[PDB]
Amino acid sequence: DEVAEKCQKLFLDFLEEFQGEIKYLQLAEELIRPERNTLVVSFVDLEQFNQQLSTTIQEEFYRVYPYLCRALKTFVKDRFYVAFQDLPTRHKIRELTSSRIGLLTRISGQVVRTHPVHPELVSGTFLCLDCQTVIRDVEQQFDTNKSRFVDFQKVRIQETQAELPRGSIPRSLEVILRAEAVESAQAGDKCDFTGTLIVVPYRLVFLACCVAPNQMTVKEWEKVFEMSQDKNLYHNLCTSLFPTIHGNDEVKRGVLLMLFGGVPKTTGEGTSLRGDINVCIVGDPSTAKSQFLKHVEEFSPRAVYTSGKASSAAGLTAAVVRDEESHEFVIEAGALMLADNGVCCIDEFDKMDVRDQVAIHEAMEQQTISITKAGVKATLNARTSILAAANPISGHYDRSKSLKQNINLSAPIMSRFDLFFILVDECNEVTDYAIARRIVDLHSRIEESIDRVYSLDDIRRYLLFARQFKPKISKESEDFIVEQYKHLRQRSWRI
Amino acid sequence: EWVSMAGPRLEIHHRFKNFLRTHVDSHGHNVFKERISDMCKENRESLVVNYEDLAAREHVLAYFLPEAPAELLQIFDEAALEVVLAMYPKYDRITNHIHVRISHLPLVEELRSLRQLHLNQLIRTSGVVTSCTGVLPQLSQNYQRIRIQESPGKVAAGRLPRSKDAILLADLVDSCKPGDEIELTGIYHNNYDGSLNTANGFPVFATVILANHVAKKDNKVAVGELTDEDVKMITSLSKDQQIGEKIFASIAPSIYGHEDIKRGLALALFGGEPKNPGGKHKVRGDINVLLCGDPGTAKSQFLKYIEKVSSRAIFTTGQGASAVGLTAYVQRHPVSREWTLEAGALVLADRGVCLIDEFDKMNDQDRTSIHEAMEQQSISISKAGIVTSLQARCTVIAAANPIGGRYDPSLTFSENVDLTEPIISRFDILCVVRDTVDPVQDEMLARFVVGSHVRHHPSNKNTYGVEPLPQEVLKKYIIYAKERVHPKLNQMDQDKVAKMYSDLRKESMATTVRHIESMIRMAEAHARIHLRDYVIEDDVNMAIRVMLESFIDTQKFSVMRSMRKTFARYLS
Amino acid sequence: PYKYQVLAEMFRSMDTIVGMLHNRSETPTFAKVQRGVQDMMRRRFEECNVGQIKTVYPASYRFRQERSVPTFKDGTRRSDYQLTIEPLLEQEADGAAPQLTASRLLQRRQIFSQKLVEHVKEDIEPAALPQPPSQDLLERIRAKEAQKQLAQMTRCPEQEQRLQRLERLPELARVLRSVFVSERKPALSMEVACARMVGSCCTIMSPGEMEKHLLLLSELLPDWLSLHRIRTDTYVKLDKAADLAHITARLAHQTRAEE
Numbered sequence A: 001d002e003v004a005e006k007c008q009k010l011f012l013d014f015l016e017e018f019q020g021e022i023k024y025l026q027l028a029e030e031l032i033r034p035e036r037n038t039l040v041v042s043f044v045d046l047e048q049f050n051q052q053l054s055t056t057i058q059e060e061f062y063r064v065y066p067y068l069c070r071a072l073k074t075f076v077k078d079r080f081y082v083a084f085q086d087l088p089t090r091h092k093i094r095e096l097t098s099s100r101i102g103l104l105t106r107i108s109g110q111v112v113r114t115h116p117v118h119p120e121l122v123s124g125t126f127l128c129l130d131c132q133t134v135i136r137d138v139e140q141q142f143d144t145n146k147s148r149f150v151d152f153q154k155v156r157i158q159e160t161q162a163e164l165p166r167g168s169i170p171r172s173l174e175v176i177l178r179a180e181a182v183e184s185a186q187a188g189d190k191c192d193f194t195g196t197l198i199v200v201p202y203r204l205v206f207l208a209c210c211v212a213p214n215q216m217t218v219k220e221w222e223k224v225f226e227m228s229q230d231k232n233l234y235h236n237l238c239t240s241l242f243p244t245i246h247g248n249d250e251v252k253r254g255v256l257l258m259l260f261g262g263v264p265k266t267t268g269e270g271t272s273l274r275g276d277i278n279v280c281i282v283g284d285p286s287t288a289k290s291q292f293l294k295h296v297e298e299f300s301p302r303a304v305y306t307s308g309k310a311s312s313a314a315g316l317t318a319a320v321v322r323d324e325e326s327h328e329f330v331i332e333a334g335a336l337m338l339a340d341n342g343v344c345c346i347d348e349f350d351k352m353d354v355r356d357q358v359a360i361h362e363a364m365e366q367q368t369i370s371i372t373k374a375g376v377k378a379t380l381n382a383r384t385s386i387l388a389a390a391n392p393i394s395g396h397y398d399r400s401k402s403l404k405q406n407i408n409l410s411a412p413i414m415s416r417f418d419l420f421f422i423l424v425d426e427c428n429e430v431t432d433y434a435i436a437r438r439i440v441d442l443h444s445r446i447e448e449s450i451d452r453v454y455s456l457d458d459i460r461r462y463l464l465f466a467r468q469f470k471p472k473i474s475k476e477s478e479d480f481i482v483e484q485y486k487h488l489r490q491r492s493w494r495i
Numbered sequence B: 001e002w003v004s005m006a007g008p009r010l011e012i013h014h015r016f017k018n019f020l021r022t023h024v025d026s027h028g029h030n031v032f033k034e035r036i037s038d039m040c041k042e043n044r045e046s047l048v049v050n051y052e053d054l055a056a057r058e059h060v061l062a063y064f065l066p067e068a069p070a071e072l073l074q075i076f077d078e079a080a081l082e083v084v085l086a087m088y089p090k091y092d093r094i095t096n097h098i099h100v101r102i103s104h105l106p107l108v109e110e111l112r113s114l115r116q117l118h119l120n121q122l123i124r125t126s127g128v129v130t131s132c133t134g135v136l137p138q139l140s141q142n143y144q145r146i147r148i149q150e151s152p153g154k155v156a157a158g159r160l161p162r163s164k165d166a167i168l169l170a171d172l173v174d175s176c177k178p179g180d181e182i183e184l185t186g187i188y189h190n191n192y193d194g195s196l197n198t199a200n201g202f203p204v205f206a207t208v209i210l211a212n213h214v215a216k217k218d219n220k221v222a223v224g225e226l227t228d229e230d231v232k233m234i235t236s237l238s239k240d241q242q243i244g245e246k247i248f249a250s251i252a253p254s255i256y257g258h259e260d261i262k263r264g265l266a267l268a269l270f271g272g273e274p275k276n277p278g279g280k281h282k283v284r285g286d287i288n289v290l291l292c293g294d295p296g297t298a299k300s301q302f303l304k305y306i307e308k309v310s311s312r313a314i315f316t317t318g319q320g321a322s323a324v325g326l327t328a329y330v331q332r333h334p335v336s337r338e339w340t341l342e343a344g345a346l347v348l349a350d351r352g353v354c355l356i357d358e359f360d361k362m363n364d365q366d367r368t369s370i371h372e373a374m375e376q377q378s379i380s381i382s383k384a385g386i387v388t389s390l391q392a393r394c395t396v397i398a399a400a401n402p403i404g405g406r407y408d409p410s411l412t413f414s415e416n417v418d419l420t421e422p423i424i425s426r427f428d429i430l431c432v433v434r435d436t437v438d439p440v441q442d443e444m445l446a447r448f449v450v451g452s453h454v455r456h457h458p459s460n461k462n463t464y465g466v467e468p469l470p471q472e473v474l475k476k477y478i479i480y481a482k483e484r485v486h487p488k489l490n491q492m493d494q495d496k497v498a499k500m501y502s503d504l505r506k507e508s509m510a511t512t513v514r515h516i517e518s519m520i521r522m523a524e525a526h527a528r529i530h531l532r533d534y535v536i537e538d539d540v541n542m543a544i545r546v547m548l549e550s551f552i553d554t555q556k557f558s559v560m561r562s563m564r565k566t567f568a569r570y571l572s
Numbered sequence C: 001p002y003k004y005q006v007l008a009e010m011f012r013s014m015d016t017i018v019g020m021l022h023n024r025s026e027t028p029t030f031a032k033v034q035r036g037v038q039d040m041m042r043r044r045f046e047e048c049n050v051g052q053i054k055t056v057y058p059a060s061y062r063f064r065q066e067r068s069v070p071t072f073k074d075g076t077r078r079s080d081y082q083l084t085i086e087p088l089l090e091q092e093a094d095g096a097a098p099q100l101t102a103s104r105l106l107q108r109r110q111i112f113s114q115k116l117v118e119h120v121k122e123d124i125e126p127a128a129l130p131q132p133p134s135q136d137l138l139e140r141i142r143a144k145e146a147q148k149q150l151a152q153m154t155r156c157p158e159q160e161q162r163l164q165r166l167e168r169l170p171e172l173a174r175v176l177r178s179v180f181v182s183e184r185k186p187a188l189s190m191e192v193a194c195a196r197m198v199g200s201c202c203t204i205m206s207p208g209e210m211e212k213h214l215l216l217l218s219e220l221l222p223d224w225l226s227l228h229r230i231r232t233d234t235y236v237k238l239d240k241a242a243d244l245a246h247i248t249a250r251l252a253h254q255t256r257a258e259e
């Protein structure tokens, strides 16, 4: 292939002339290190240096990759594998078709299963048993001492929830990792893999090379700065986050606070203190019990929604299922572990059986879930914030009975919610007028009846910027908290 | 390749013969002649040679052994065989082949650390045995195939335990049992398997270790690894008159108050001395602790701290623990399809500690299997035509919440907890924790909690009045006390305990032998705390005090006042 | 001396560990060397004694601070510096890679002992190891200022919005080019192109904003980028051979002019 040799020469040119310091000289020198055998090359540098080479590599990656490896070996020997990063285009798993075979693309998914590291024989030195002829450098079409082996890892990935179209089963894909890409991915993580779609006998498999998990523009940064100095920022955010909901602003403040969340702390004894907030809303019907769940689900991309009775114990935390091909037992993820570092919303929490809530118990407080079933022993992180919605017994708050008799929930469950709001409906003419006018205005004037102080994207950016700070507690705050807790505890839902 | 040369090969063989017939220990004794005489007396088929002495004497042999294991080991086996024939010509009649075993390899590697570079090299590894096959004959020999998983204590949280295959020949056959922690020195070879190649779609070699030496990982190795500075620090701590106070205060610094619970848990952790009087009945030397608590008392925090401290620890939850999961079960192997035993949580908890959370959620059917392991510390599995016995010497700490979420002081302890009487009887220490509204105690709790919160910020990163010990120092003290002390009860006044037990019978029928046994092993553990070869009666007094406190804590309010009045002599 | 004897013994242990790590193509880290020495001699190992060795015979090793050292599944972050040690060996004339043979080991321990004897003939200070890198009047003045600022902002807001968008046009344009590089197509619809750009842009934006930005690009720079109205849709065509640097310069000039 003449074009392959041209690509090799052009890659040598890029390695030898890219710059006032050549970025890749130190990387090539470190490639001499035995633990380092893959080179990471930015795609943007390749495309800016020249465009014909960039297009050729993006189009015939499988065709020229061994020539790229040969170029790397030649460049290093003058004084090994090639990895690429920062491809500007993201693609969906449902987009993977046969027309894209051999193209350098990066795919986003979630790792669900992992397999141990295996040696893969690349070039084998074969000894003939008839004439004792040694055949060296035999490539494999998919003497151990003199042959070459490369570390291998197999990964099974699943479609992301956001990209999943309604009513569709999330397809799974097999990913092959080699050399430094081995063991760089962990089960339950979301990753973008850069590589190609190869043809296995047929079968569809992705060969990957890399994994994925101050510089902001001036105007966005200045908008964030300006809105950070607002004196009425709290109320403005509360109003903008729920423009169509009338009253009940305490619930708005609570959900905003749990969106912000606290800081987790780990003691010297290794014990982890939960830095999250769990919220329970219980109320008579016709209130806004659900709408908050939908708003927080649509706003936060890391939100998961679920119903009460339709969810089983296995579906919430995790399940143990036997794998068909491996003839062993593996773990299928539940909703809680998929909602990691996010928010999980449960509707009609009362209808859930006690057998399910007792399973929730561990993830509620210890923030982790442990499984000891059928010879499978594991612990998994469940760092989630739970928002639960429910109604009182018989659907109506009966004032003829005590407050405790009006909630059919266990004592620890009542204890483990930070905020517990109870909503009571009353017949007032002014409230009726306000509710009716708001509803009819929304029904008639859909868009012109919305006044948002800040954009939803702006709120998201501000929240992302704010969540990384870790404030310190002052001594004045310390003794104020001490005295406030004194007064509060000196007076069902025990404190 | 260079070793395969005939000249150097033969010369090294004779040099190894001279090493066998010439080495002198520090005491002037030719050790290998005593070893070979012992082997001849025992009619064994293997010889054990220390790698350290060989490295000290012949550096070239120590360099060659990890690099060319199979050929050099075969040559050494031949040399040992001919040395035996020259020394004991008749020994050919009892054995035809003798194998050389290499022990104490300096390089120890983990199952996770196995790569391509270690292929066909002698490696030392550590782990726990999970399943084993039977003795299989070969048309060459004895065969054993075993499956080894990583030790659960060494495995970090959130990551599955990996498993490997191991092969034992002749003498090494049946030298280990499932659930036994062992270290191995063996060759990391690769095997050709076409099924893996077809499944994965590319050439894959299943790496299987051929072990040369097997050594069960008793705590003797841990004792050997101890630095003499650790021993001197432990001894200096032992002479302190307030060693007990600081030891108790060193547990759960982040939790305020609750002296009795930490006292009982430490006393159970140090453990008693298991005994086998006559080999007819076995008296357990283990303490089973039950913790019944009102919500909000940080029971899970105590369990987590115990999980972290213990060298060997397994954590289980109530809902996720089935009867099959906790115990070993029989399964058909997916490849070879012979019946195999997979160890449960308790089996892997042997010599370690097992924690049960929300024990009140246990199904009664799952509860039934527990009593056998609790009473006898051994499990007999009779399934699918296979009857086996496995060791279950473990210390069990169980947590529980009263029915209804609140402990009623007007009822008996049996009524408040949904557990049968035998289960409670198997437990040695019972601790109930209640919630009281005390303003001064509330102030203390709030102040301590906020102080701990301030201390342990990542940016920033007692009742007895004694300074807590460092965690590493406490762990080293625990290990040394577990592995050195064996107290003797030669100075106990039987009349006092007999009268106390008669009073206990009177006041229990007004409202057993295993209670006496629990108190005895409690006194033994308290003596072990002070590193005393003989038990002083102060240990007995403290054990009586804490046992009486635990007993009165389980009674109704209308009678505990009378019990305290009657037993004010001992509680004071 | 006894301290010098301990120094020589641990130097021998260090040399053995370094040779074992280096002969199998493995990078010698400080933690592995410390673990090996502690197992071999049952004694504490620390950087002060390494600095003492460097003071005694500095030619033994080269000490470096390095990153990107694979520590297996130990949970170690990448930003953690690691102190690596490289043995300093004379290159043989045979062309083979130098290896710490037992002869070289004996030579090194003999030279270390000779240096110790020379020091006696004359504690050792450790060498510096490479460290890792009225109220009414005020209210009326405020009201006057607010009225003046309101009169200032009576100018059409869109005048600044375009300016805002003018700062966003270049970068997005780059992405657009890559999009047409990726799709192997001469022209694309508004919907698919906007969806892909949003899915690849660094900023979360609405499809309508992308459409308005595309319209602004078409109106400012028609020669590069063309729009064709077909049936019920508008399609986008671009010239892929144009130099991006000159176009970026033109966009910067246009933004400056609009300022």
Ligand SMILES: Nc1ncnc2c1ncn2[C@@H]1O[C@H](COP(=O)(O)OP(=O)(O)OP(O)(O)=S)[C@@H](O)[C@H]1O
Pocket (backbone or CB within 6 Å): A244, A245, A246, A247, A284, A285, A286, A287, A288, A289, A290, A291, A292, A435, A438, A439
């Ligand atoms: N304050 C309010 N502002 C605007 N609409 C409201 C308000 N309160 C009630 N509504 C309307 O009433 C509906 C009832 O809200 P939902 O949360 O769906 O019902 P619910 O109270 O959760 O009862 P369940 O749990 O579904 S049986 C809302 O979807 C709104 O259309």
Ligand SMILES: Nc1ncnc2c1ncn2[C@@H]1O[C@H](COP(=O)(O)OP(=O)(O)OP(O)(O)=S)[C@@H](O)[C@H]1O
Pocket (backbone or CB within 6 Å): A365, A412, B254, B255, B256, B293, B294, B295, B296, B297, B298, B299, B300, B301, B401, B445, B449
């Ligand atoms: N006495 C205490 N001193 C200090 N912190 C405490 C104390 N009691 C509770 N806490 C804190 O409360 C947190 C939650 O307590 P938990 O362990 O969940 O309560 P619990 O007693 O175990 O009852 P359950 O099992 O959760 S129903 C702990 O992680 C501690 O931080």
Ligand SMILES: [Mg+2]
Pocket (backbone or CB within 6 Å): A288, A289, A290, A291
């Ligand atoms: Mg609802």
Ligand SMILES: [Mg+2]
Pocket (backbone or CB within 6 Å): B298, B299, B300, B301
């Ligand atoms: Mg708890």
